[PDB]
Symmetry: C2
Subunit: 133 residues, 2 copies
């Protein structure tokens, strides 16, 4: 195998944003974030941790990605949806969320792992393709 | 923090393909793969592990993504490039590689973490945008 401490060091250092969260009913509470996620969000580790990251949505909460994420998490299936989130400075970015539900048989509670990426460029290009079509 | 054993369990179960590799000169040798990477490649864990994953390129080795990956790994900077890889059955897919170099100060050798995704759909749509333009 691999030393879990080494794997943790690799995850903390990945330029991709990696987050882990635990379920508390309707809400999903974050338990781990990496430095890449801090850079993408602008918020700090203590500021982000131990809450649901729906705060990144802010007032812009009428987004279809929310519902498909909620539906997938309830159905126990992975999902990959793009939402418009806002940084601490107020900058708006398109974030692709790859959320995968995991069940710890020993704990009998549910955790979620998410990998994020600023795909604002891809969204703009596909919008350009749409207006051409 | 978070229990590294739990983080390892979350990584093993992510639907995104996560791999870790160690550097041996020009070659980079894999030390960890997850079940998602097995599904994307079709090859098995024992078949994939402990080798450079350039084998996914096969005869199609005249690809510009190779060089930019090699340049970035040498420069100690992360990279995100798309390459055409081939599964065990011979199926061809466009794989986006997010490779992040990590240096263990204690070990003084270099490891790499990569997150993969079959972006064949995105490549086809951008090709369609190009022929429209
Ligand atoms: C958040 N990324 C993210 C990562 C994980 C691992 C989970 C489980 C969830 C998110 N996420 C979605 C948000 O937390 C809510 O779960 C979602 O809106 C559905 O529930 P709701 O309809 O709010 O009750 C994130 N959303 C974001 O906006 N940005 C992220 O990076
Ligand atoms: C491979 N994904 C991948 C993941 C990591 C963590 C690394 C370090 C490298 C790759 N990778 C690239 C390949 O192994 C070579 O490093 C690359 O071609 C540059 O060196 P070379 O020019 O061959 O000497 C992968 N390539 C793939 O084709 N598919 C993957 O998923």
């Amino acid at each position: 195998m691999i030393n879990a401490q080494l794997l943790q060091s690799m995850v903390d250092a990945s330029n991709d944003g990696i987050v882990v969260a635990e379920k508390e009913g309707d809400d999903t509470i974050l338990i781990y974030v990496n430095a890449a996620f801090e850079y993408l969000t602008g918020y700090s580790r203590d500021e982000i941790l131990y809450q649901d990251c729906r705060f990144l949505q802010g007032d812009d909460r009428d987004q279809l990605g929310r519902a498909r994420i909620r539906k997938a998490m309830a159905e126990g299936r992975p999902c990959r949806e793009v939402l418009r989130n806002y940084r601490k400075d107020g900058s708006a970015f398109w974030n692709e969320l790859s959320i995968t539900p995991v069940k710890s048989d020993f704990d009998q509670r549910t955790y979620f792992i998410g990998i994020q990426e600023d795909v604002s460029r891809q969204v703009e290009l596909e919008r350009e393709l749409a207006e051409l079509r």
